[PDB]
């Protein structure tokens, strides 16, 4: 741990500075260092962790998609052989992506999830576990693809079960979990009907609970509801 000599509070401060500077790789390294101090994370700290890694992995996924598209074109009938470079570089980006996902999954397993007892933390971490298994599934092509898919599904399902028992239907973590599990169904598990059903049921149940919310909570919940509707519009 290169961050082992820095105070936990200094790591959190620097993560916030790195965010302002759009240095998300630094942000993620600082938050990994903070997690490795061994104390549970507050709400704000959990979101700093997730923002950092989402930005890092998101850039890697975008690059992998560009490279995969070029590679599939080099493999069409009538393309000019270019040698191994496209495959090799796609593999390099893929391996770095897998490493980031393994790092995040490792932090969740050592020991964020096992110490998370409140629904807001436990659902958040299990959603992340499903998300990072989902990113692994996006690039998986081997003996382990089915097992990676089932690991994502299992994490999302445990998060869903807790969220339905312990959170209101408008809770933004519950909504974002459902949004992402719906995407898992559509894009990973070849279950578009389940994806659509989940998005629509989640939206309708949240709609009926908006009346209980303050103006600020209403803004937070309806923002995620709009993403559910956006996906439903894309899919129907």
């Amino acid at each position: 741990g290169a961050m082992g000599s820095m105070e936990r509070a200094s790591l959190i401060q620097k993560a916030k500075l790195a965010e302002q500077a759009e240095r998300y790789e630094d942000m993620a390294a600082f938050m990994k260092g903070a997690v490795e101090k061994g104390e549970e994370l507050s709400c704000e700290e959990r979101n700093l962790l997730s923002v950092a890694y989402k930005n890092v992995v998101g850039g890697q996924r975008a690059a992998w998609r560009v490279l995969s598209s070029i590679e599939q074109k080099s493999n069409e009938e009538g393309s000019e052989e270019k040698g191994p470079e496209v495959r090799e570089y796609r593999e390099k980006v893929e391996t770095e992506l897998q490493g980031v996902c393994d790092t995040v999954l490792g932090l969740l397993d050592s020991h964020l999830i096992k110490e998370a007892g409140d629904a807001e933390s436990r659902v958040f971490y299990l959603k992340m576990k499903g998300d990072y298994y989902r990113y692994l599934a996006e690039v998986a092509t081997g003996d382990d693809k089915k097992r990676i898919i089932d690991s994502a599904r299992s994490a999302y399902q445990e998060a869903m079960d807790i969220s339905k028992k312990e959170m209101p239907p408008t809770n933004p973590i519950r909504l974002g979990l459902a949004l992402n599990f719906s995407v898992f169904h559509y894009e990973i598990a070849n279950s578009p009907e389940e994806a659509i059903s989940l998005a629509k049921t989640t939206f309708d149940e949240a709609m009926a609970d908006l009346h209980t919310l303050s103006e600020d909570s209403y803004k937070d919940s309806t923002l995620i509801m709009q993403l559910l509707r956006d996906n439903l519009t894309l899919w129907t």
């Binding site: 995407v183 894009e187 995620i224 996906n231 899919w235």
Partner: peptide, 5 residues
């Protein structure tokens, strides 16, 4: 690509 958060 669909929206995720």
């Amino acid at each position: 690509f669909p929206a995720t958060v």
